[PDB]
Design a protein around this ligand. Structure first.
Ligand SMILES: Nc1ncnc2c1ncn2[C@@H]1O[C@H](COP(=O)(O)OP(=O)(O)O)[C@@H](O)[C@H]1O
Ligand SMILES: Nc1ncnc2c1ncn2[C@@H]1O[C@H](COP(=O)(O)OP(=O)(O)O)[C@@H](O)[C@H]1O
Ligand SMILES: Nc1ncnc2c1ncn2[C@@H]1O[C@H](COP(=O)(O)OP(=O)(O)O)[C@@H](O)[C@H]1O
Ligand SMILES: Nc1ncnc2c1ncn2[C@@H]1O[C@H](COP(=O)(O)OP(=O)(O)O)[C@@H](O)[C@H]1O
Ligand SMILES: [Zn+2]
Lengths: 443, 45, 434, 434, 437
């Protein structure tokens, strides 16, 4: 099955009908203000009325702002795209930071285009050069059309094609019983391979045997393909066709991220505007997520101003676990939360607070029921005392070894002696930090 | 036009076996699937 | 219900600078309000750019954060007109690991200047009657039909190769260029395509054209000096324009391109038009790009540029000494400074009133008192976000008119930077790297 | 007398990690003595690795230098069993000029996740006795020989065209696949190739295959996740796989990889095996990497992390801060810390007795007191070198067993770092850059 | 017309025949000692007998150092190559910082070459390859038809490869040269345009004159262009030269062996007398931005015997050397290079001399300014700066065009000076509001 993820127990925000945040919903307890604020944010995402909006999430480590940001995508669904990106990915050797952020802005937004396809496929029963009778003194023989037979399990059908395609059928190898791909709209003819029925005549043959297609001879089906503006920017960035020698050699070369000029962006915006005016393509906005925003360079902080002031900028969310810190790139400059005041004024700050011991016990119970672990009352109280003493995260991490050791000992439930032995063997971060002080001279 | 396909498939030499023939044997002049039946065919020939 | 690629934004609602024919600033026009001094100066630079008789000039804009320094540049950008080229670049954009910063500056200066070229070509447009080809060189004929006249033309070797390469068959409306040689199929006829082969290909249909078959059309285009320099430098580099792989172009090629463009202006076949280069937060740009910009601006092809500076009296990056506006005295004295006066209380009410017509959100008269007070105590941007989210919660309560309780709800949901700093001081000890 | 590519090493004297049903570490197990809680927690997290029910877990080991962090790490790795994906990389290995550090750590997390698949195939591999063809559709047969049997194959026209295109001749050992149709030439026979006076530039000798000529069997292939990335990124993924030239991989291809592998897991065809990622000397690492490890742990899929820090408090490179284990406090809580204890003077004698069996050099009970005195007063590795360096002097003395005078002699030949510092203080003025 | 340039009004140094500097000449006023000092410099560059000379210009910003550099550039003429360079240009990701300074010398020195070319061009009546046993083509037979006559010639398989490369067919006009070996195609003759009512190929008339014509072509090329041509095989008839022609033209460093070989072949051309070498002038602006390593290479660069004359521009005083982190040197130039360079002193302009600059620039911009506005612009210019009054000329003319006045007035200058802010006043305003910044 699916491997259990730390955030996999968060299925969404769990909002009510009136907009208020239920206390316990979708495995989330507490943080009513943050869940309601994000509850308005998802209404902005669904509304699509504004662009370039930047939200900020601040608070102590372990408050669940990442669980809320990831819960936003779960509440929105799979219709709108969601692009989490850490600030560490902004620094790259080949591609510049501004091109990284731009390509992320193109990664958020996406398109969906509906298209119909008509395809003829099957085994070839017969191929005839149908000859009409029109003898002329200028040219002796006349051929009106070529008949191509096709056989499938559901039915057989014959097709009357112009003789011009027989020049390609004679240009490439075509044998009786060859399963071929023929599209009516494109008009091109490709050879799939030999049918599996004739594979029994020879013990060894070079041609591979593809099975006969199961279905009607003429297949017309409508499929909607979703392609993001970033994919469009890459396909427009490098040619996919390898007919050219420079495209073949460049295809042999190692692919590297290239800086894309704004002209291609403008052309994409224009053709996208045209298809939107036609109504065939459906455009949906994306949701960009950013974690460890305090790790960005000051050049990225100033670039986010011109990036956010644009109307094509998708909604961006930020996550900052740090307080007042020195801005990276400048030694003597200090700013609250680790972000300059210019961007910090533009972003919408959301405050988060630490959980109470009761909420710690409830979250521990939720994680226990998620991982499928049973906890006794008293051991849950002592574990809540441990989490309150140090952190919620450590008390969450203490669940697995007590479950495994409990199964080894034969007890299907966790006991205070189990969490006591586990708490004795393993060391919390603060206790280890205090132990390092005495032996620091030997280190 | 495609010719009429052969109805009967080829079969193995030892006829408690028979399966589509994997290879042909020149010494015994008969087709066999595996060395197991090949021992019986070579012993019979 | 259809949503374009463009969406509502901070500076997007501005349709222009709102200026009269006398260039004197109007209080409220074209989505801009207040700041008569900077509006008038923006009128001076707009009339100057429309004159275009002078080149190599730099205009700087300075003021307090939140005075609309970007709103003015977007105002002149939208009021300049579509036919005039405009380019907006940021200091962090010209920094790249592939090419040098100075080369990026040359791409900016040569990119801002537009070149308009007109082309007159005679094309043939009509519905194909029949297509005949004889292969032994292949020689064939093409019979076309229009409502005014029916024509018959002969096809050559390259023409047959082009049509057969384009998969052109009888019954399709096509457009052929005599001088260029290009063929573009527009579609098929309804009646001629009503009876088709059993293949049954359904793609598109186009009505039969009318009038003369061969007509003369004029198609005007604009090409950037950087585009021409990349195309001619890469030796058929048409893909390198969209790919962006080109870099470090030789200066001799650029000089030859400048001389050839000057010769084109002397011939009159091509015209040169000025363009604007907008730079925001230039104070973070390295001093090397400033020293290269001062001497590089002296060129005749160097367009007029406009820079903006948020702060003042700050050391330049790479140097340990402080300078006004983070700019050396050579450049700071080399360009003119335009100061923006901070907005007053009377203008804030009108700025918040513009969002009523722009966002189509009905605002009560009692909301402008508290909302205006929030605009006085806090940032006007936070006031605008308070208007947007206040309209979201207003829709949540399904009311037509904005209520103060909804604004109090949004104000309870979102906190100001100063408040987040106040709580960050209480929880700062638990926060990392305090 | 034959020497393999592997030789005796510091961590090579231990094979496997002894445990019990109650996870009680033995006093001496597989050459490991001490660290009861460390070995017990290592068995707990090891059984956790064997379960693999959860992902995104990080375990940091803490203790004084010389406590056997790499010893217990390698013991856990060997006790985990073979065919388990294991990647142990130094903190400096992720630094590369061609690749970014995010791509280095990313590929480090991707390569340690294996996938076991099952595929049935049929192959015909044997030595060709003869080849004959007749062209009027050409019909031909070939005679093959194996130790068990010899048989002929009648092949079609194009199947003849493949062998004739490859210039295949009789007497060569080849492999033929009927389903795919490709031909793989392994080489030529010894007796057949012996007739030639000289051999070509590219040739090889392969013994006659034994067993069934045509084998139809099911084989379980174990693949790694890092291989698919290059193959789906480039047309040729193996060339850049062995060359290591690929770098800066797009995340969209990785997302499509995770989606397709998730589809395979939904089909139940292949099952994923968890893996171990070990990082040593993590005290020196980039804060950007420390920020990336957050989402690396919060990802849906990720191998188990085992990291070692040899320093209690050290300033992180790139910033000025004081933090435990040279790691930030935000990532400090994501780690499961296992403390260790220094080795007792009584256990030193035991582990030295274990090290005697590695060199098979017997030592008297009186020598373990001096060698243990050196392993106590000074670093243990110095004494581990004292026994090996002393055995050579013993062989120079032509004695059957080492003596205390050997450890005294080698102790006079080699000095401790503290002693070299003491002499370096006397001669330090003569040394450069004192 | 031509766009107005800041230095466009400077036509040269404005010196008499005796070498003295006139008060106002060639659009330049003042700096009599500087212009008179350059009067010997232009005689040195025109004398060409000396090399490895560097002349530094020391003066306050806005005193016309660059105007003196471009003034010398206009004084030497168009035949003398003049290469401007900025201190920030030497930094490049593709090549080392030294290679730029080394290439700027080859780009500075120009070379005039006369080339005698034999030309065979005209209509192609027949083209057939010969067949020889190894099916290889040993020779080519191509006839040439012209209005003067018809002559059959034989071509090599390489020239045939260039023809098939150009898709040459019977009935087209081509251009063929011998020494270079390249092949061009002019187009199809106009006589055949009547057979097809519609054709993609454009038609050109049949040329006139003899088929074979020897002509002399005098071309001016730079030793840096020659150095790049010898450095990389971009042009040529080779298929590898075509592939490299398709490849991106990234910059690469040139080896000293190739440079010495260039000196050998150019020296042989000078000994033959067909090529005429002329010295160049290398100008360096914002020299204080150059690195101490670039100066270290400038030690050997200026001491080189083949180095063209180099002029430097320094607008700053005592400053810390780039990269030294400690030592500060006068004019941003270390004492080692500063001892070698020749320094020229530049003085600030006087209040009386500033008004003449304001008037000359006002006339250059095409604006009619009254004497009152001239005296006011001079007064405020002496109060703050000359550059400010220079920048106030155009906007006041714009206000004059708006109000309909034919000339600028004190209310126009007062309104423009009221709108725009001086650097001193703005810097003073930044102090009160600095807490808000
Ligand atoms: N309210 C909550 N309910 C349940 N689990 C939570 C809650 N808040 C946080 N968690 C858990 O804590 C883990 C770590 O959260 P983290 O990303 O550190 O939060 P933050 O980003 O606010 O520091 C997550 O895997 C999540 O499952
Ligand atoms: N002249 C103006 N008219 C209308 N709105 C304005 C004007 N100037 C500024 N604003 C509003 O103020 C908000 C913040 O402006 P800001 O970009 O901070 O100005 P600056 O760039 O000068 O700091 C913008 O969202 C904009 O809508
Ligand atoms: N418990 C143990 N039993 C046997 N040998 C050990 C033990 N612990 C450490 N060693 C040996 O000590 C040597 C040095 O260990 P070292 O890598 O310095 O440990 P650490 O990484 O904790 O400093 C290793 O080669 C290992 O074989
Ligand atoms: N003596 C002069 N006569 C006329 N114009 C001058 C003179 N000196 C300088 N200028 C003008 O002043 C303008 C600014 O000079 P600038 O290049 O800043 O001097 P510097 O290079 O010394 O800083 C130039 O465009 C130039 O045309
Ligand atoms: Zn059998």
């Amino acid at each position: 099955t699916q491997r259990i993820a730390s955030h996999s127990h968060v299925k969404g925000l769990g909002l009510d009908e009136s907009g208020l945040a239920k206390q316990a919903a979708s495995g989330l307890v507490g943080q009513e203000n943050a869940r309601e604020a994000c509850g308005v944010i998802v209404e902005l995402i669904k509304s699509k009325k504004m662009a370039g909006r930047a939200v900020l999430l601040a608070g102590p480590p372990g408050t669940g702002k990442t669980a809320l940001a990831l819960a936003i995508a779960q509440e929105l669904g799979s219709k709108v795209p969601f692009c989490p990106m850490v600030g560490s990915e902004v620094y790259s050797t080949e591609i510049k930071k501004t091109e990284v952020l731009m390509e992320n802005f193109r990664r958020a937004i996406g398109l969906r285009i509906k298209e119909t396809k008509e395809v003829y496929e099957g085994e070839v029963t017969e191929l005839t050069p149908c000859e009409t009778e029109n003898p002329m003194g200028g040219y002796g023989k006349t051929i009106s059309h070529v008949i191509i037979g096709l056989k499938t399990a559901k039915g057989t059908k014959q097709l009357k094609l112009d003789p011009s395609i027989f020049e390609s059928l004679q240009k490439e190898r075509v044998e009786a019983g060859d399963v071929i791909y023929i599209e009516a709209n494109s008009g091109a003819v490709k050879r799939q391979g030999r049918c599996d029925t004739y594979a029994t005549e020879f013990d060894l043959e070079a041609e591979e045997y593809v099975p006969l297609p199961k279905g009607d001879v003429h297949k017309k089906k409508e499929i909607i393909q979703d392609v993001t503006l970033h994919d469009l920017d890459v396909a427009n960035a490098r040619p996919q066709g390898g007919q050219d020698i420079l495209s073949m050699m460049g295809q042999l070369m190692k692919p590297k991220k290239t800086e894309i000029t704004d002209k291609l962006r403008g052309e994409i915006n224009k053709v996208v505007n045209k298809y939107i005016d036609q109504g065939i393509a459906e455009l949906v906005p994306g949701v960009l997520f950013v974690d460890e925003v305090h790790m960005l360079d000051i050049e990225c902080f100033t670039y986010l101003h011109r990036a956010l002031e644009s109307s094509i900028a998708p909604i961006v969310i930020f996550a900052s676990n740090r307080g007042n810190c020195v801005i990276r790139g400048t030694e003597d400059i200090t700013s609250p939360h680790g972000i300059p005041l210019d961007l910090l004024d533009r972003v919408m700050i959301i405050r988060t607070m630490l959980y109470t011991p009761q909420e710690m016990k409830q979250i521990i119970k939720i994680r226990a029921q998620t991982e499928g672990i049973n906890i006794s009352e008293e051991a849950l109280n002592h574990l809540g005392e441990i989490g309150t003493k140090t952190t919620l995260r450590y008390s969450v991490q203490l669940l697995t070894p007590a479950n495994l050791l409990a199964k080894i000992n034969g007890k299907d439930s966790i006991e205070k002696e189990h969490v006591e032995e586990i708490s004795e063997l393993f060391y919390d971060a603060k206790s280890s930090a205090k132990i390092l002080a005495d032996q620091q001279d030997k280190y | 036009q495609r010719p009429s396909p052969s109805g009967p498939p080829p079969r193995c030499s030892v006829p408690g076996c028979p399966h589509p023939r994997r290879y042909a044997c020149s010494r015994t002049g008969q087709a066999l699937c595996s060395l197991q039946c090949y021992r019986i065919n070579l012993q019979m020939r | 219900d259809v949503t374009r690629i463009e969406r509502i934004g901070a500076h997007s609602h501005i349709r222009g600078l709102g200026l009269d024919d006398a260039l004197e600033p109007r209080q409220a026009s074209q989505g801009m309000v207040g700041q008569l001094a900077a509006r008038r100066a923006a009128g001076v630079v707009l009339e100057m750019i429309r004159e275009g008789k002078i080149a190599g000039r730099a205009v700087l804009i300075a003021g307090q954060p939140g005075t609309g320094k970007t709103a003015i540049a977007m105002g002149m950008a939208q009021a300049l007109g579509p036919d005039t080229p405009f380019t907006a670049i940021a200091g962090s954009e010209i920094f790249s690991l592939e090419m040098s910063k100075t080369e990026a500056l040359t791409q900016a200066f040569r990119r801002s200047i537009g070149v308009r070229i007109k082309e007159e070509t005679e094309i043939i447009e009509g519905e194909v009657v029949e297509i005949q080809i004889d292969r032994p060189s292949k020689v064939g004929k093409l019979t076309l039909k229009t409502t005014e006249m029916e024509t018959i033309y002969d096809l050559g070797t390259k023409m047959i190769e082009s049509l057969t390469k384009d998969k052109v068959q009888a019954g399709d409306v096509i457009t052929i260029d005599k001088a260029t040689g290009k063929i573009s199929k527009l579609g098929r006829s309804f009646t001629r395509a009503r009876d088709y082969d059993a293949m049954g290909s359904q793609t598109k249909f186009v009505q039969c054209p009318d009038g003369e078959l061969q007509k003369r059309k004029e198609v005007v285009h604009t090409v950037s000096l950087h585009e021409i320099d990349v195309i001619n430098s890469r030796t058929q580099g048409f893909l390198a324009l969209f790919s962006g792989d080109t870099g470090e172009i030789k200066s001799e090629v650029r000089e030859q391109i400048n001389a050839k463009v000057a010769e084109w202006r002397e011939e009159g076949k091509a015209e040169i038009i000025p363009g604007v280069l907008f730079i925001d937060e230039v104070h973070m740009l390295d001093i090397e790009s400033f020293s290269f910009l001062n001497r590089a601006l002296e060129s005749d092809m160097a367009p007029v540029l406009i820079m903006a500076t948020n702060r003042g009296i700050t050391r330049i990056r790479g140097t340990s000494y402080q300078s006004p506006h983070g700019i050396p005295i050579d450049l700071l004295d080399r360009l003119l400074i335009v100061s923006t006066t901070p907005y007053s209380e009377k203008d804030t009410k009108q700025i918040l009133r513009i969002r009523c017509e722009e966002e189509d959100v009905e605002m009560s008269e009692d909301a402008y008192t508290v909302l205006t007070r929030i605009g006085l105590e806090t940032s006007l941007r936070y006031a605008i976000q308070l208007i947007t989210a206040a309209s979201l919660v207003c829709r949540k309560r399904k009311g037509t008119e904005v209520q103060v309780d909804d604004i109090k709800r949004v104000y309870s949901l979102f906190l100001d930077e100063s408040r987040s700093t106040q709580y960050m001081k209480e929880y700062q000890d638990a926060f990392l790297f305090n």
